[PDB]
Symmetry: C3
Subunit: 149 residues, 3 copies
């Protein structure tokens, strides 16, 4: 049984030109790219993305830093929602484990390179917000017999 | 004092073509390749290899998954039996620490890329099972003065 | 709010020819190279560097291991003193976390590749010991807006 998570490379990942390195980390585990799209995030879509934080004082600056090119992604794998969060590491890079994306690439929470869904419910919500259903592609990885038990 | 451990790249490591990457992780610490052999594992030898698991429900599927090309290896280093196990990570890739082989490459325990000896006794037994003594090569690393205290 | 730490590649890092790999790990987080100098460490300066170990019985051997080429470095970043220590890993490579420098490259404490300042006071002392003020370079990283919140 596989699931799908929403992963988004933030404008700092684009501008520091580490998009390929990020994708490679997920491909390395045999996670399948089910969707991928470059767009420019706008305040209106970011308000819906960060709806849980509506009204808080840090949201305006969060929206400013996120207004920029982003890579929208959907990856598929076993337990991929929780596993992708583990691979990203703590929100605060200084607290993130060595070997995680945020520990390896970043210094502060406000520039922490990547977003990933925190639950099944948020993955469904975020994939619907950032993608049309035709953009989610169904295909099977040829190495499936050596990735899955 | 150094010791020797038995490490085996499983068929998923061969088929996903990450043999070199695996070897590089161990070379990176100054561990010495003492033996190396590509073979195709067969049920009879695998039954001896996994003798401790005799009777367990998962053994027949383990033997099936392991029937295939494997790279037999012996690496030498300080505390290398326990250290190689630490580098491999937990049996379940999803529980393994970021930066370990299983966390970085794998999803499920049944396809977790690599075997390593779990103790001094099992290392001795496994090395003798898969290698004849004439296959074990003794030489000194040129950088020994900078690897060992 | 950034600080500066003193990092030193030990003779084993020079001789194993992993200087560039070490530097890349720190550059990867957006840490700024503020100073860099190759020198051959002498017992006199090593005695002052390791003054906290004066009179102890392991000091003569530490100074001997360290008498050789070293790369003196100053890196700048948020919390970089503690963070560089985290990236280096425990003194004993066998105890260091996977994904740290010492865990990924080394076997024994006496050959553990790199030194880093362990506190604000030690960083100030060590930078001043190994560098004149004229050797510390002030410039701004062009990616600062994408590194710092
Ligand atoms: N005090 C805060 C709170 C959060 N953040 C930013 O806001 C994002 C959303 O906050 P949160 O959901 O708590 O962390 P993450 O889920 O890890 O962030 P994201 O959803 O974008 O992955 C964080 O990634 C972080 O960059 C911040 O800069 N300062
Ligand atoms: N419930 C289980 C138990 C184990 N395994 C498989 O059987 C192998 C041997 O089991 P075990 O010795 O308990 O784990 P490890 O020592 O981590 O595996 P290995 O000896 O091959 O290194 C595991 O690596 C794993 O591939 C499994 O698929 N399901
Ligand atoms: N019993 C000891 C004590 C220390 N060391 C060596 O002496 C250095 C300094 O010791 P210590 O300051 O206690 O460890 P670290 O701070 O991790 O080392 P460094 O200052 O060089 O970063 C260590 O890096 C290690 O190479 C050793 O070989 N064995
Ligand atoms: Mg979130
Ligand atoms: Mg075992
Ligand atoms: Mg110290």
């Amino acid at each position: 049984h596989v699931e799908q998570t929403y992963l988004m490379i933030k404008p700092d990942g684009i501008q520091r030109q580490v998009v390929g390195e990020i994708i490679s980390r997920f491909e390395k585990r045999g996670y399948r790219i089910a969707a991928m799209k470059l767009t420019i995030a706008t305040p209106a879509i970011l308000e819906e993305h960060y709806a849980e934080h509506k009204g808080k004082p840090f949201l305006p600056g969060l929206i400013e830093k996120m207004t920029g090119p982003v890579l929208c992604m959907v990856f598929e794998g076993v337990d991929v929602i929780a596993q992708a969060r583990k691979m990203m590491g703590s929100t605060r890079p200084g607290e993130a484990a060595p070997g995680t994306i945020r520990a390896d690439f970043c210094q502060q929470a406000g520039r922490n390179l990547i977003h990933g869904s925190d639950s099944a419910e948020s993955a469904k919500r975020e994939i619907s917000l950032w993608f049309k259903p035709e953009e989610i592609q169904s295909y099977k990885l040829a190495l499936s017999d050596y990735i899955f038990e």
